[PDB]
Amino acid sequence: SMLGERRRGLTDPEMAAVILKALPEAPLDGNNKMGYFVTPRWKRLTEYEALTVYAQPNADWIAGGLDWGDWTQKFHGGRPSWGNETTELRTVDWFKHRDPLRRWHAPYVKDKAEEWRYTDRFLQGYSADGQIRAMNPTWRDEFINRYWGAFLFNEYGLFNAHSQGAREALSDVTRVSLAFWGFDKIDIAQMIQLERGFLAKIVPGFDESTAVPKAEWTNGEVYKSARLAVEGLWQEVFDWNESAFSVHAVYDALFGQFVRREFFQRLAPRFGDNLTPFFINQAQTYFQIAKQGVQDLYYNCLGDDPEFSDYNRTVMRNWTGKWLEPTIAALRDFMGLFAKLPAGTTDKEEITASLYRVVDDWIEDYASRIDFKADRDQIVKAVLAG
Amino acid sequence: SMLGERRRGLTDPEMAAVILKALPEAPLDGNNKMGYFVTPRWKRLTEYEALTVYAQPNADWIAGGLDWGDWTQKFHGGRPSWGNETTELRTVDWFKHRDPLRRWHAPYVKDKAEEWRYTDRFLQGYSADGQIRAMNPTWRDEFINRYWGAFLFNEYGLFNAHSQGAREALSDVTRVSLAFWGFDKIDIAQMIQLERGFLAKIVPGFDESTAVPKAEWTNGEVYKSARLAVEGLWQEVFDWNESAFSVHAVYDALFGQFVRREFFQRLAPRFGDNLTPFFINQAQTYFQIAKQGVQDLYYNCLGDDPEFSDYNRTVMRNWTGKWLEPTIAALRDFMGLFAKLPAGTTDKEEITASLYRVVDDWIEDYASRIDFKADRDQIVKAVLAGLK
Amino acid sequence: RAPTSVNAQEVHRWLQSFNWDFKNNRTKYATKYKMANETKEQFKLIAKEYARMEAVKDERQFGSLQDALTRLNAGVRVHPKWNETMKVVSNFLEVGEYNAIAATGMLWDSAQAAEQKNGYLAQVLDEIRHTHQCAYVNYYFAKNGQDPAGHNDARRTRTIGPLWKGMKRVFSDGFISGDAVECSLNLQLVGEACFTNPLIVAVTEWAAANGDEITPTVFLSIETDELRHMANGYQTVVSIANDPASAKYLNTDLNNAFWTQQKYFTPVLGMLFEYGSKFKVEPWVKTWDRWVYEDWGGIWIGRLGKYGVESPRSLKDAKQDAYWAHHDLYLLAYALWPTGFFRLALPDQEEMEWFEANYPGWYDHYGKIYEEWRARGCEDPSSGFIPLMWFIENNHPIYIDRVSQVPFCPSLAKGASTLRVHEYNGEMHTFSDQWGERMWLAEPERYECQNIFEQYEGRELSEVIAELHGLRSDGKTLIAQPHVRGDKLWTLDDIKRLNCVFKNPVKAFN
Amino acid sequence: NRAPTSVNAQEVHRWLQSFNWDFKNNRTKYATKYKMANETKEQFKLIAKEYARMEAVKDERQFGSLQDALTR
Amino acid sequence: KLGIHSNDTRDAWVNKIAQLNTLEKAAEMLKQFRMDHTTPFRNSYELDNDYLWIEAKLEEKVAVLKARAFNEVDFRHKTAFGEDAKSVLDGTVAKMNAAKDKWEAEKIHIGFRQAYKPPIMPVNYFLDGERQLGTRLMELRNLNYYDTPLEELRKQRGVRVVHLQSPH
Ligand SMILES: [Ca+2]
Ligand SMILES: [Fe+2]
């Protein structure tokens, strides 16, 4: 029917009249601020905080919880749904964390969506503009298809390393950031594959199959230690914080940053490749975005906790030393890829300098926050051994 | 008052009841398709077409018009509000054009908005990632600040060249495309300035003032003929189609494409500059987007018009020859910038090859459509003469 | 050089190859099952595309909310009873959405095939969307509605009442505690397919009927995502159908999951629907029978029969204990009204006629009781009466199921009236059915949830309410109310005067 | 220093007035008895990108209300 | 002082834990607390309403003390009692696989938790244990879950039936 059979209380004269007659004269409380009881991180409570903080039904026995009592149903054995036992880190309040970008779901997908739609437009403009022409064939079929491609498995692995944290995180704010950190990683891994798939369409003979880059990752020498580190951060770590912390404030801050920025971002241009740098721009935006959250959680909240500052820093330094080694090894092996480059592409001085940039930034943004005494010369020299 | 004083016919019981009682049982016509009478370019009428075609109140005496009679008020002298006299091109129907991207206002701003927000995110990630460190100082303070910067005036000028077409375009579809072509140009010019402004913030000593690049544009040698061509396309052309056609299917397809793609896009990377290429990616996306529209209007609709195909091609060939010369001159002068580059940056063979790419693409996507006989060797050799 | 790009499915084609083999590439969670590491997902999505299809949905949702719905004052022109009901429906769903985030994060860890992981991952994100969505409903009604209290702090004020406890069972702990597969059944195979999906639509129906256009706008948007949760719940059964352990454990975990879920929603949803509204949409008995028997227990489980899945053995029980369950519960919920974070109302005459018409015998039991309570003055703060007193006076003790947390009064109930009390190592336990009792007997360490009578024992009512912030911003008037009118709202003092002190009903068997 | 920074529309607009340069035929193509001072300023410091963003935000709502709640 | 989140009972334990300034004392107290107040096997239910909160405040102390007392390798691989974490795990997992029935299995699992829950055992080994022990416990328990009738099951669990009521 033009009007439909269903009648609606907002528009149906009869029903609405009944509704209006039952309404009070004014609201029964002037406090129209949902989440009003939440301690604001900034001047005013943000939509981000209101919609997130305390969504996790934690009881007071899990630092910061507002509920009471045990969980209604636990695991066989007695393991609590969520508990202090899932991480070595301790705090006065797990809901203290705040994503500096204040990303709740809607804003998050809105941004990635913009990036997706623009990426589509970019590629369509890139292909029509015939820019592929000026790209070095060897760099394309070798370093992008094989080595850049193999790197997708590194990102994929870091992605999966977040699976347990998504399940164990002790608060909504931390759970959401964690979910976004890992989701950005799978995104990157798929973008690396998107490029390979794109090239397959404009370059007659480029096989988009992951077979080659996968074989490079699983059996190669270049990424051997890298893969060994990834398999460990992912499957040998059961502590959701050690996992997140070690992945972002150690391995990816060093190895990842070097590969992405100091190798591909730095050299692709030299071979007439403006394509790969387009995707790395995203990966680096994502990285810098995650870094702010990682810093707030581990340094601002945990490392600087009013009661467990000392304890937490001790633990993160422990983790830093535990993972710094496998990370150095991953970098050491990576050094082998430079010998595969056409002579004259870059020299030992450039590589050392770039290594120093990655290491200094790391000491800059991470190591120094927990008073981890790091020797930059020792780290670089250990890597250069390649 | 929690409810407010104003009563609404959709929710007010009394008023709605009166409204509902006056309603017919079913719609008074089953044809709920606005623009149903419009000839679809594709399988089904698109929202783009419905919302656009025939918005311009043209009478039948302007090819394609559905109205009748003279305008109600004209210019002193008698010039019509819109008329056939504002362009040499003729057609069977001015509403024939269709932006291949089907861009009406909402979709247009949505895309530029996405690009704007991402640009913001990119720069914030670029600055925090300290990537500026690996950029060559000379390339930065010289080729980006001065030469790339000066190019903004080229884009600005091309932007302004659209002002008369926005006023004179003989149909909605063509008017909208034209407006979007020009708006993308001012956007680019502002993006070139955005980069200069960005660098000013992360590079202590980089002056974002436009004085230097403007002096390069107004009084330099590198862009001299380029500026002379821009001043002409903009202010010496009163025919809105010659303007749009010459700007996009001639000058910018050759000079613009060479500067943006074959110089800055091609060399910036070599100097550790991933910044500029980010903005040029946009400019090139915009260019390829406009090209589709330009092609549909001038080749698909006009150049292939069932009645004025011959006539229109004759005129566009006339315009191509008229503007190809000043464009070659603009490129010739541009060749001078290569001597300013650090030795070894690029050689004569690279430059010739790149010139040939721009020229072959042009013959590819434009010249050939109107049967303009273009000699690629002659064009390139004329330009190469500019190499100092 | 034609304009070309790459779409999500073109990249997804190679997603399955993303995972590689190595010694410790295995689940970190305990599980009796073995998810085939070649399992495929139904939707070929990648992060970028997922975000785009979700952002497009947001545009509309928030557009309608911040613009036309606000201009129409949709936040106010809702029936009072329903404004209260939405405080519970939205916040309770919120936690189900929020634990579903952790739950699928656990399933994502369990899956070994890259495609099955990606499927769960998309839900981990959807669930985060739904958490924030449900949150927004409360947020919107707080900012724009006729009564913010409860909407503005349900996250802490929900802890006061007993209804919240059972909610965490089916939608929190039941979602993340136990075998990944068992949890998957609670969340996807039963919870979402049997209750949540049909429920979400039902709520938009009841909402629209009571002037609420806010909820339909958000919930109908949430609904568009459930197609993907279903595929995951269905893919879970497939990924284990080939493992020999599945033929030995699947049906037991499924039956337990079915019971766990229905035990709570059968009475709670029906209650929120029929008693939390003014205008009715359809009798809950009819609704329940279609969802659980026709749609789920018949069509949904029938298609999984080829994988070894069978109809839950406790199905017939569930049906017989269902008819009056929601009516039995409202009596307790209203009697304990001061422990909520929402205002409840007694059935008006029009409604009593409706109830009796759809539930023969309703009046002679519940109807007469509600009338007595109103004569007693349960709606008036100066009466000094609270329905809980009537329960004490007529020796009708109220117990809490040690397992499901669902409140029950066996001496008064018209539905199930079974009661099993046990003592084990110095502790008393009260059960309301043979299925929950078996669960506790077999897995006593999984169910040690202290009920409200235990925690509040010896405590004076007003003090528990005051301690847990059950007040409005004036610091005196209770958030909860025994009526939905604008005046004569009970205050903390009206409650203190009743001098009501909690007692653990089980201490009587002593 | 690597602090997260960007540039907003008004920061670019500051130099927009300098975009136009002088030359013989830089004049209106239309008849007019008036002379618009070539130093006139505009009230809103906008650039194409920002203009598009503030308009697209308005569209989101408008079309959202139309395709969703208003249609329902 | 009576309260849900704050009461005399809780204050009492706070002062009690404040007096534990030795990893060994603290670690032993936490273990003792777990035997006395947690799981269906606790020695008493006197702290039912506060144990969860008290236990956590106790773990905090053991953790802080363990961090200052242990070197890096030990903090990662040894329990607060000096035991080698991997050994305890592999040992307990061994018995769990040798478990003859669900009644022995649950004893092992529940006891493991009472004794080694962090900060006693490093979380990595503990959750690794949770994964293996839990899997065996379930396999044994969910086999013919409904065969044993309630009458018998109550006897097996060893509960004292205090009251039964059933119109059907
Ligand atoms: Ca050469
Ligand atoms: Fe959901």
PDB file of C-alpha atoms in Angstrom, chain A residues 6 8-10 15 18-20 22-24 27-29 31-37 47 50-57 67-78 81-82 104-106 109-110 112-113 116-117 120 123-124 127-128 130 153 156 159-160 162-164 166-168 171-172 175 179-180 183 187 190-191 193-194 197-198 201 208-210 214 217-218 227 230-231 234-238 282 286, chain C residues 1-6 10-11 14-15 17-20 22 24-26 28-29 46-52 55 58 62 76-80 94-95 98-99 101-102 105-106 108-109 114 117 121 125 128-129 132 135-136 139 142-143 145-148 151-153 155-156 158-159 164-165 168-169 173-174 176-178 182 205 208-211 213 279 343 405 443 445-450 455-456 472-473:
ATOM      1  CA  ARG A   6       2.580  -1.066  10.006  1.00  0.00           C
ATOM      2  CA  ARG A   8       4.433   3.905  13.845  1.00  0.00           C
ATOM      3  CA  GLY A   9       4.234   5.540  17.233  1.00  0.00           C
ATOM      4  CA  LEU A  10       6.075   8.623  16.006  1.00  0.00           C
ATOM      5  CA  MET A  15      -0.505   6.002  18.976  1.00  0.00           C
ATOM      6  CA  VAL A  18      -1.194   8.211  23.645  1.00  0.00           C
ATOM      7  CA  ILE A  19       2.586   8.566  23.753  1.00  0.00           C
ATOM      8  CA  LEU A  20       2.524  12.342  24.111  1.00  0.00           C
ATOM      9  CA  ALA A  22       2.279   9.865  28.955  1.00  0.00           C
ATOM     10  CA  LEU A  23       5.331  12.113  28.641  1.00  0.00           C
ATOM     11  CA  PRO A  24       6.639  14.056  31.651  1.00  0.00           C
ATOM     12  CA  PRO A  27      13.401  15.304  31.486  1.00  0.00           C
ATOM     13  CA  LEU A  28      13.555  13.380  34.779  1.00  0.00           C
ATOM     14  CA  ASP A  29      17.239  14.269  35.129  1.00  0.00           C
ATOM     15  CA  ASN A  31      22.361  15.127  33.345  1.00  0.00           C
ATOM     16  CA  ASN A  32      22.127  14.174  29.660  1.00  0.00           C
ATOM     17  CA  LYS A  33      25.803  13.177  29.489  1.00  0.00           C
ATOM     18  CA  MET A  34      26.328   9.471  28.927  1.00  0.00           C
ATOM     19  CA  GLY A  35      29.620   8.436  30.554  1.00  0.00           C
ATOM     20  CA  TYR A  36      29.563  11.529  32.775  1.00  0.00           C
ATOM     21  CA  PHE A  37      31.256   9.539  35.545  1.00  0.00           C
ATOM     22  CA  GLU A  47      32.605  10.901  22.214  1.00  0.00           C
ATOM     23  CA  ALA A  50      31.902   7.976  26.377  1.00  0.00           C
ATOM     24  CA  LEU A  51      31.299   5.237  23.841  1.00  0.00           C
ATOM     25  CA  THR A  52      34.217   3.078  24.989  1.00  0.00           C
ATOM     26  CA  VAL A  53      35.416   3.274  28.613  1.00  0.00           C
ATOM     27  CA  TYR A  54      33.797   0.666  30.903  1.00  0.00           C
ATOM     28  CA  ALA A  55      32.177  -1.290  28.103  1.00  0.00           C
ATOM     29  CA  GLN A  56      34.229  -4.230  29.443  1.00  0.00           C
ATOM     30  CA  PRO A  57      32.267  -5.644  32.424  1.00  0.00           C
ATOM     31  CA  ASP A  67      31.587  -4.387  38.810  1.00  0.00           C
ATOM     32  CA  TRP A  68      31.751  -6.920  41.635  1.00  0.00           C
ATOM     33  CA  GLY A  69      31.919 -10.677  41.960  1.00  0.00           C
ATOM     34  CA  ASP A  70      33.388 -13.550  39.989  1.00  0.00           C
ATOM     35  CA  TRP A  71      32.448 -14.240  36.386  1.00  0.00           C
ATOM     36  CA  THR A  72      29.271 -16.271  35.853  1.00  0.00           C
ATOM     37  CA  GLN A  73      30.977 -18.917  33.733  1.00  0.00           C
ATOM     38  CA  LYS A  74      34.687 -19.722  33.558  1.00  0.00           C
ATOM     39  CA  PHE A  75      36.904 -22.149  31.658  1.00  0.00           C
ATOM     40  CA  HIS A  76      37.193 -25.806  32.626  1.00  0.00           C
ATOM     41  CA  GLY A  77      39.834 -25.652  35.353  1.00  0.00           C
ATOM     42  CA  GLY A  78      38.601 -22.321  36.633  1.00  0.00           C
ATOM     43  CA  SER A  81      36.904 -14.920  31.545  1.00  0.00           C
ATOM     44  CA  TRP A  82      39.437 -12.104  31.953  1.00  0.00           C
ATOM     45  CA  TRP A 104      36.370   4.276  17.989  1.00  0.00           C
ATOM     46  CA  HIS A 105      34.874   2.143  15.199  1.00  0.00           C
ATOM     47  CA  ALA A 106      33.120   4.755  13.053  1.00  0.00           C
ATOM     48  CA  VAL A 109      36.615   2.666   9.150  1.00  0.00           C
ATOM     49  CA  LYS A 110      35.854   6.123   7.769  1.00  0.00           C
ATOM     50  CA  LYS A 112      40.533   3.434   5.965  1.00  0.00           C
ATOM     51  CA  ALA A 113      37.563   3.768   3.622  1.00  0.00           C
ATOM     52  CA  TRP A 116      40.707   2.609  -0.003  1.00  0.00           C
ATOM     53  CA  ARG A 117      38.657   4.735  -2.402  1.00  0.00           C
ATOM     54  CA  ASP A 120      41.500   2.888  -6.308  1.00  0.00           C
ATOM     55  CA  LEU A 123      45.857   3.149  -9.398  1.00  0.00           C
ATOM     56  CA  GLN A 124      43.374   4.025 -12.131  1.00  0.00           C
ATOM     57  CA  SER A 127      47.708   2.902 -15.114  1.00  0.00           C
ATOM     58  CA  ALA A 128      46.139   5.428 -17.491  1.00  0.00           C
ATOM     59  CA  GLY A 130      51.368   4.957 -18.198  1.00  0.00           C
ATOM     60  CA  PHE A 153      54.124 -12.514   5.351  1.00  0.00           C
ATOM     61  CA  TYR A 156      50.633 -11.004   8.196  1.00  0.00           C
ATOM     62  CA  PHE A 159      48.849  -9.277  12.412  1.00  0.00           C
ATOM     63  CA  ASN A 160      48.179 -12.721  13.854  1.00  0.00           C
ATOM     64  CA  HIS A 162      47.412  -9.747  18.013  1.00  0.00           C
ATOM     65  CA  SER A 163      44.815 -12.548  18.087  1.00  0.00           C
ATOM     66  CA  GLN A 164      45.417 -13.406  21.733  1.00  0.00           C
ATOM     67  CA  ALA A 166      42.059  -9.196  21.181  1.00  0.00           C
ATOM     68  CA  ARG A 167      40.854 -11.998  23.422  1.00  0.00           C
ATOM     69  CA  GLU A 168      42.796 -11.202  26.596  1.00  0.00           C
ATOM     70  CA  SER A 171      39.969  -3.172  29.107  1.00  0.00           C
ATOM     71  CA  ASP A 172      37.893  -1.769  26.258  1.00  0.00           C
ATOM     72  CA  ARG A 175      41.257  -3.926  23.380  1.00  0.00           C
ATOM     73  CA  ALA A 179      42.391  -4.565  17.439  1.00  0.00           C
ATOM     74  CA  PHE A 180      43.172  -1.516  15.304  1.00  0.00           C
ATOM     75  CA  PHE A 183      43.922  -4.777  11.634  1.00  0.00           C
ATOM     76  CA  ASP A 187      45.647  -4.276   5.703  1.00  0.00           C
ATOM     77  CA  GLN A 190      46.918  -7.140   1.627  1.00  0.00           C
ATOM     78  CA  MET A 191      48.112  -3.863   0.084  1.00  0.00           C
ATOM     79  CA  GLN A 193      49.460  -8.170  -2.489  1.00  0.00           C
ATOM     80  CA  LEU A 194      47.213  -5.550  -4.106  1.00  0.00           C
ATOM     81  CA  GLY A 197      47.962  -7.996  -8.349  1.00  0.00           C
ATOM     82  CA  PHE A 198      47.933  -4.555  -9.974  1.00  0.00           C
ATOM     83  CA  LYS A 201      47.375  -6.437 -14.850  1.00  0.00           C
ATOM     84  CA  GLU A 208      50.586 -12.315  -9.013  1.00  0.00           C
ATOM     85  CA  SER A 209      50.731 -15.758  -7.408  1.00  0.00           C
ATOM     86  CA  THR A 210      52.162 -15.642  -3.885  1.00  0.00           C
ATOM     87  CA  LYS A 214      56.069 -17.142  -0.086  1.00  0.00           C
ATOM     88  CA  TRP A 217      59.777 -16.083   3.087  1.00  0.00           C
ATOM     89  CA  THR A 218      59.553 -19.739   4.101  1.00  0.00           C
ATOM     90  CA  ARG A 227      60.444 -15.159   9.963  1.00  0.00           C
ATOM     91  CA  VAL A 230      57.731 -13.468  13.712  1.00  0.00           C
ATOM     92  CA  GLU A 231      56.897 -17.100  14.461  1.00  0.00           C
ATOM     93  CA  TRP A 234      53.126 -14.744  17.350  1.00  0.00           C
ATOM     94  CA  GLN A 235      53.033 -18.302  18.742  1.00  0.00           C
ATOM     95  CA  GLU A 236      55.544 -18.517  21.569  1.00  0.00           C
ATOM     96  CA  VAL A 237      54.252 -15.501  23.470  1.00  0.00           C
ATOM     97  CA  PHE A 238      51.104 -16.022  25.587  1.00  0.00           C
ATOM     98  CA  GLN A 282      50.021   4.211   4.068  1.00  0.00           C
ATOM     99  CA  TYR A 286      49.553   3.454  10.084  1.00  0.00           C
TER     100      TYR A 286
ATOM    101  CA  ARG C   1      47.181   1.947 -20.793  1.00  0.00           C
ATOM    102  CA  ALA C   2      43.500   1.724 -19.842  1.00  0.00           C
ATOM    103  CA  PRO C   3      42.291   2.794 -16.337  1.00  0.00           C
ATOM    104  CA  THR C   4      42.571  -0.296 -14.122  1.00  0.00           C
ATOM    105  CA  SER C   5      42.677  -1.234 -10.434  1.00  0.00           C
ATOM    106  CA  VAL C   6      42.386  -4.247  -8.115  1.00  0.00           C
ATOM    107  CA  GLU C  10      41.243 -10.196  -6.398  1.00  0.00           C
ATOM    108  CA  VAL C  11      43.563  -9.936  -3.396  1.00  0.00           C
ATOM    109  CA  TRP C  14      45.606 -15.374  -2.398  1.00  0.00           C
ATOM    110  CA  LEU C  15      44.711 -14.738   1.235  1.00  0.00           C
ATOM    111  CA  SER C  17      48.275 -18.720   1.219  1.00  0.00           C
ATOM    112  CA  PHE C  18      49.190 -16.004   3.732  1.00  0.00           C
ATOM    113  CA  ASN C  19      49.575 -18.528   6.545  1.00  0.00           C
ATOM    114  CA  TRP C  20      52.694 -20.714   6.501  1.00  0.00           C
ATOM    115  CA  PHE C  22      55.982 -24.107  11.454  1.00  0.00           C
ATOM    116  CA  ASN C  24      54.329 -23.851  17.052  1.00  0.00           C
ATOM    117  CA  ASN C  25      51.746 -22.598  14.573  1.00  0.00           C
ATOM    118  CA  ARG C  26      48.790 -23.760  16.657  1.00  0.00           C
ATOM    119  CA  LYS C  28      46.931 -20.923  22.265  1.00  0.00           C
ATOM    120  CA  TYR C  29      43.557 -21.947  23.672  1.00  0.00           C
ATOM    121  CA  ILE C  46      40.104  -7.307   2.865  1.00  0.00           C
ATOM    122  CA  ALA C  47      40.516  -4.610   5.509  1.00  0.00           C
ATOM    123  CA  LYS C  48      40.120  -1.700   3.071  1.00  0.00           C
ATOM    124  CA  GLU C  49      36.859  -2.943   1.524  1.00  0.00           C
ATOM    125  CA  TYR C  50      35.434  -4.022   4.882  1.00  0.00           C
ATOM    126  CA  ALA C  51      35.994  -0.502   6.207  1.00  0.00           C
ATOM    127  CA  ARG C  52      34.341   1.030   3.171  1.00  0.00           C
ATOM    128  CA  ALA C  55      31.594   3.444   6.724  1.00  0.00           C
ATOM    129  CA  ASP C  58      27.626   4.732   9.232  1.00  0.00           C
ATOM    130  CA  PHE C  62      24.569   8.995  11.915  1.00  0.00           C
ATOM    131  CA  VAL C  76      11.716  12.459  23.181  1.00  0.00           C
ATOM    132  CA  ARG C  77       8.513  11.370  21.412  1.00  0.00           C
ATOM    133  CA  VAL C  78       8.911   7.807  22.660  1.00  0.00           C
ATOM    134  CA  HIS C  79       6.654   6.074  25.163  1.00  0.00           C
ATOM    135  CA  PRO C  80       8.066   6.351  28.719  1.00  0.00           C
ATOM    136  CA  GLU C  94      26.380  -3.698  24.291  1.00  0.00           C
ATOM    137  CA  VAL C  95      28.197  -6.135  26.567  1.00  0.00           C
ATOM    138  CA  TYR C  98      31.742  -6.308  23.517  1.00  0.00           C
ATOM    139  CA  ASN C  99      32.404  -9.862  24.687  1.00  0.00           C
ATOM    140  CA  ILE C 101      34.894  -9.006  20.289  1.00  0.00           C
ATOM    141  CA  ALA C 102      37.021 -11.072  22.673  1.00  0.00           C
ATOM    142  CA  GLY C 105      39.439 -12.852  18.831  1.00  0.00           C
ATOM    143  CA  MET C 106      39.673 -16.252  20.504  1.00  0.00           C
ATOM    144  CA  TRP C 108      40.549 -16.107  15.233  1.00  0.00           C
ATOM    145  CA  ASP C 109      43.380 -17.570  17.339  1.00  0.00           C
ATOM    146  CA  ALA C 114      44.041 -17.964   6.883  1.00  0.00           C
ATOM    147  CA  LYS C 117      40.843 -16.459  10.655  1.00  0.00           C
ATOM    148  CA  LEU C 121      38.579 -11.102  12.224  1.00  0.00           C
ATOM    149  CA  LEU C 125      35.740  -5.590  14.038  1.00  0.00           C
ATOM    150  CA  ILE C 128      33.525  -3.502  17.988  1.00  0.00           C
ATOM    151  CA  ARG C 129      31.192  -1.595  15.693  1.00  0.00           C
ATOM    152  CA  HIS C 132      29.928   1.388  19.926  1.00  0.00           C
ATOM    153  CA  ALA C 135      26.603   2.548  23.204  1.00  0.00           C
ATOM    154  CA  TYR C 136      25.416   5.285  20.861  1.00  0.00           C
ATOM    155  CA  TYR C 139      24.287   8.061  24.446  1.00  0.00           C
ATOM    156  CA  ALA C 142      20.734  10.319  27.367  1.00  0.00           C
ATOM    157  CA  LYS C 143      21.440  13.509  25.462  1.00  0.00           C
ATOM    158  CA  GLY C 145      15.591  11.678  25.824  1.00  0.00           C
ATOM    159  CA  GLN C 146      12.998  12.177  28.557  1.00  0.00           C
ATOM    160  CA  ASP C 147      15.113  10.394  31.170  1.00  0.00           C
ATOM    161  CA  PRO C 148      18.949  10.202  30.922  1.00  0.00           C
ATOM    162  CA  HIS C 151      21.105   5.584  29.866  1.00  0.00           C
ATOM    163  CA  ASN C 152      23.988   7.748  31.056  1.00  0.00           C
ATOM    164  CA  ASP C 153      25.529   5.247  33.490  1.00  0.00           C
ATOM    165  CA  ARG C 155      27.806   0.558  32.680  1.00  0.00           C
ATOM    166  CA  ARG C 156      28.098   0.947  36.450  1.00  0.00           C
ATOM    167  CA  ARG C 158      23.640  -2.259  36.008  1.00  0.00           C
ATOM    168  CA  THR C 159      25.844  -3.983  38.581  1.00  0.00           C
ATOM    169  CA  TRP C 164      22.635  -8.115  34.825  1.00  0.00           C
ATOM    170  CA  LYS C 165      24.257 -11.270  36.254  1.00  0.00           C
ATOM    171  CA  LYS C 168      26.993 -11.784  31.542  1.00  0.00           C
ATOM    172  CA  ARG C 169      26.400 -15.545  31.469  1.00  0.00           C
ATOM    173  CA  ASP C 173      31.349 -15.400  29.965  1.00  0.00           C
ATOM    174  CA  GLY C 174      29.333 -17.804  27.822  1.00  0.00           C
ATOM    175  CA  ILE C 176      34.563 -16.290  25.927  1.00  0.00           C
ATOM    176  CA  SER C 177      34.937 -18.877  28.715  1.00  0.00           C
ATOM    177  CA  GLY C 178      35.401 -22.538  27.833  1.00  0.00           C
ATOM    178  CA  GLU C 182      31.601 -24.298  22.827  1.00  0.00           C
ATOM    179  CA  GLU C 205       9.548  -3.512  15.538  1.00  0.00           C
ATOM    180  CA  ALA C 208       8.812   1.674  16.078  1.00  0.00           C
ATOM    181  CA  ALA C 209       5.540   0.687  17.733  1.00  0.00           C
ATOM    182  CA  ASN C 210       6.378   2.824  20.749  1.00  0.00           C
ATOM    183  CA  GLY C 211       7.591   5.928  18.923  1.00  0.00           C
ATOM    184  CA  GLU C 213      12.844   5.600  15.548  1.00  0.00           C
ATOM    185  CA  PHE C 279       1.883  -0.928  22.221  1.00  0.00           C
ATOM    186  CA  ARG C 343      11.826   2.624  35.802  1.00  0.00           C
ATOM    187  CA  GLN C 405      22.002 -16.408  37.463  1.00  0.00           C
ATOM    188  CA  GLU C 443      31.933 -28.545  36.268  1.00  0.00           C
ATOM    189  CA  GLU C 445      34.756 -24.856  39.254  1.00  0.00           C
ATOM    190  CA  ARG C 446      33.216 -23.151  36.215  1.00  0.00           C
ATOM    191  CA  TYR C 447      30.292 -21.782  38.249  1.00  0.00           C
ATOM    192  CA  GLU C 448      31.173 -19.974  41.473  1.00  0.00           C
ATOM    193  CA  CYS C 449      29.259 -16.763  40.785  1.00  0.00           C
ATOM    194  CA  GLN C 450      28.204 -15.043  44.013  1.00  0.00           C
ATOM    195  CA  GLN C 455      26.877 -10.279  48.330  1.00  0.00           C
ATOM    196  CA  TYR C 456      24.142  -8.075  49.826  1.00  0.00           C
ATOM    197  CA  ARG C 472      20.055  10.613  39.831  1.00  0.00           C
ATOM    198  CA  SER C 473      22.144  13.769  39.652  1.00  0.00           C
TER     199      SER C 473
END
